């Protein structure tokens, strides 16, 4: 029995174009613990993305926060790309500043 | 407020890729304060919050020696679990443990915890009496018999009622500027047209600590639980948490909807509406 | 600080 990750992509603060911020991808509710997460800018992997220390919830499922500094603009597109044993192919969730 | 300390242990086997990884993290409430990882270059229990850094070298030596012992103990436990479930040495498996203590409003023990899981499923738990066990299956019943024979529950009770409470109170005092400060949510409602006919109202709670919160929508004073999209509370990366709740509303009906927020940092529950 | 009691399943 395995559990597939929930995924949310969002900013540390409300987005304002031209102002520096942090781009977060929170993956949670998954089991087993092996997971691969990339943050993308215009389809390309952002380097040196950091993540929180692995831990787990009351239901034993795991969670991680991946994060990097970024400066949002009108046209730049950001996303989080997740792979897990439960997924046939990588799952891509686009950053939407309204969520 | 009501404070808790928890330790989380995980061992993950990986046959063909070395020995099982062993990790430990400690929390006070929603603040991580120590970490250990057998895959670190030089494994050691390490600080993760400013208020634990003042513990002297002998604190770190003891915690590191405990975690290094636990790396070996939980690797043995993974081997035992293979025997208990008739599993081969080819698969990857996970054992997890959580334990710790909750305090009431006066700093006294509210209850203790000690539970384990195997491959993500409950395995054995110490009951709230801190004296008896609940085993999830016939494998855990074998463990229960061993732990009854060795009077394990009595020793865990002594830790949970003694050192766990005493050290949690010490940490709360050393971190009294942060651990004992609730940050209330910053709240607002946004409006997102979906079509000529409907729009999303999204009620936001941002910047709050600790993570517990209640966030709901009402229409004409009636809860909209079945029609609300409620995202999981999520970390912002600055110690605080975020959450939102959204409802799809007919065009022109926005003022029938109210958002309701409860959080420890709020003296009274809040009501908000869309303010165009 | 952590408990020292070793738990062998």
Residue with tokens 């070298």: B57
Please tell me if residue B119 touches chain A, with a CB cutoff of 8 Å: yes
By Cβ distance, the residue of A8, A31, A32 closest to B231 is A8
Among candidate residues B245, B244, B247, the one with its CA nearest the CA of residue B200:
B247
Residues B183/B205, Cβ–Cβ less than 8 Å:
no
| Chain B residues touching residue C2 (CB < 8 angstroms) | 7, 24, 26, 63, 66-67
State how far the Cα of A11 lies from the Cα of A65, in Å rounded to an integer.
12
The second-level CATH assignment, the architecture, of A6-94 is Sandwich (2.60)
Helix ranges, chain B (H): 57-84, 138-149, 152-159, 165-174
Phi first, then psi: give them for residue A66, nearest 5 degrees: -105, 140
Q: How far is CA B267 from the centre of its chain?
A: 25
The nearest CA of chain B is from the CA of C7 a distance in Å of: 7
Please tell me if residue B214 touches chain C, with a CB cutoff of 8 Å: no
State how far the Cα of A95 lies from the Cα of A24, in Å rounded to an integer.
9
- The answer for residues whose C-beta is within 8 angstroms of residue B268's C-beta and 6 or more apart is none
Query: CATH 2.60.40.10: which residues of chain B?
Result: 186-272
| Chain C residues touching residue B143 (CB < 8 angstroms) | 9
Q: Which helix (H) or strand (E) holds B230?
A: strand B229-230
Residues A30/A20, Cβ–Cβ less than 8 Å:
no
- The answer for residues whose C-beta is within 8 angstroms of residue A45's C-beta and 6 or more apart is A38, A39
Tell me the two tokens of residue B124.
């054995």
Among candidate residues B138, B99, B143, B90, the one with its CA nearest the CA of residue B4:
B99
Q: How much of chain B is helix, strand and coil, in % rounded to 5? A: 25, 40, 35
Helix (H, G, I), strand (E, B) or coil at B139: helix
**Structure solved using which method?**
X-ray
Tell me the two tokens of residue A25.
């991808």
Q: What's the CATH number for B186-272?
A: 2.60.40.10
Residue with tokens 């003891």: B62
The nearest CA of chain B is from the CA of A34 a distance in Å of: 9
Helix (H, G, I), strand (E, B) or coil at B102: strand
Among candidate residues B218, B244, B212, the one with its CA nearest the CA of residue B231:
B244
Is C6 in Cβ contact with B77 (below 8 Å)? no
Query: Count of H helices and E strands in chain A?
Result: 0, 9
The residue ranges of every structural domain in chain A are 6-94
Is C2 in Cβ contact with B155 (below 8 Å)? no
B3-175 domain in CATH 3.40.50.300? no
Give the residue from chain B lying closest to A13, CA to CA: B236
- A83 forms beta bridges with A36
Residues B256/B220, Cβ–Cβ less than 8 Å:
yes
Please tell me if residue B152 touches chain A, with a CB cutoff of 8 Å: no
| Chain B residues touching residue A29 (CB < 8 angstroms) | 232
State how far the Cα of A16 lies from the Cα of B127, in Å rounded to an integer.
50
Which chains does B contact via 3+ CB–CB distances below 8 A? A, C
Among candidate residues A56, A36, A31, A27, the one with its CA nearest the CA of residue B92:
A31
Residues A72/A21, Cβ–Cβ less than 8 Å:
yes
State how far the Cα of B102 lies from the Cα of B121, in Å rounded to an integer.
23
Residue with tokens 């000690």: B114
State how far the Cα of B187 lies from the Cα of B262, in Å rounded to an integer.
11
Phi first, then psi: give them for residue B219, nearest 5 degrees: -120, 125
State how far the Cα of B184 lies from the Cα of B261, in Å rounded to an integer.
10
State how far the Cα of B26 lies from the Cα of A93, in Å rounded to an integer.
31
Query: Count of H helices and E strands in chain C?
Result: 0, 0
C-alpha pair distances (Å), B131 with each of B9, B110, B112, B258, C5: 22, 15, 11, 47, 16
Q: How far is CA B157 from the centre of its chain?
A: 21
């Amino acid at each position: 029995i395995q559990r597939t990750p929930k995924i949310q992509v969002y900013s540390r603060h409300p987005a304002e174009n031209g102002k520096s911020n942090f781009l977060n991808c929170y993956v949670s509710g998954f089991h087993p613990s092996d997971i691969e997460v990339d943050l993308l800018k215009n389809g390309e992997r952002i380097e040196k993305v950091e993540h929180s220390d692995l831990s787990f919830s009351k239901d034993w499922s795991f969670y991680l926060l991946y994060y990097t500094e970024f400066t949002p603009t009108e046209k730049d597109e950001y996303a989080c790309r997740v792979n897990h044993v439960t997924l046939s192919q990588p799952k891509i969730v686009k950053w939407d500043r309204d969520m | 407020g009501s404070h808790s300390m928890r330790y989380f242990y995980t061992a993950m086997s990986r046959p063909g890729r070395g020995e099982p990884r062993f990790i430990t993290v400690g929390y006070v409430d929603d603040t991580q304060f120590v970490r250990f990882d057998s895959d670190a270059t030089s494994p050691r229990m390490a600080p993760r919050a400013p208020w634990i850094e003042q513990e002297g070298p002998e604190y770190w030596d003891r915690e590191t020696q405990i975690s290094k012992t636990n790396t070996q103990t939980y690797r043995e436990n993974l081997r035992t679990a293979l025997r208990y479930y008739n599993q081969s040495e080819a698969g990857s498996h996970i054992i997890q443990r959580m334990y710790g203590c909750d305090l009431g409003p006066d700093g006294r023990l509210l209850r203790g915890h000690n539970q384990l899981a195997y491959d993500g499923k409950d395995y054995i738990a110490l009951n709230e009496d801190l004296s008896s066990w609940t085993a999830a299956d016939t494998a855990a019943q074998i463990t229960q018999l061993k732990w009854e024979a060795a009077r394990v529950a009595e020793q865990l009770r002594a830790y949970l009622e003694g050192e766990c409470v005493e050290w949690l109170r010490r940490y709360l005092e050393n971190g009294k500027e942060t651990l004992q400060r609730a940050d209330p949510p910053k709240t607002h409602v946004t409006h997102h047209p979906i079509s000529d006919h409907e729009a999303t109202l999204r009620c936001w709670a941002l910047g709050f600590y600790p993570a517990e919160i209640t966030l709901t929508w009402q229409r004409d004073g009636e809860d909209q639980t079945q029609d609300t999209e409620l995202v999981e509370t999520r970390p912002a990366g600055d110690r605080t948490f975020q959450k939102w709740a959204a409802v799809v509303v007919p065009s022109g009906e926005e003022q029938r909807y109210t958002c309701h927020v409860q959080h420890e940092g709020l003296p009274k529950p809040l009501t908000l509406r869309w303010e165009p | 600080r952590q408990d020292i009691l070793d738990l062998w399943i």
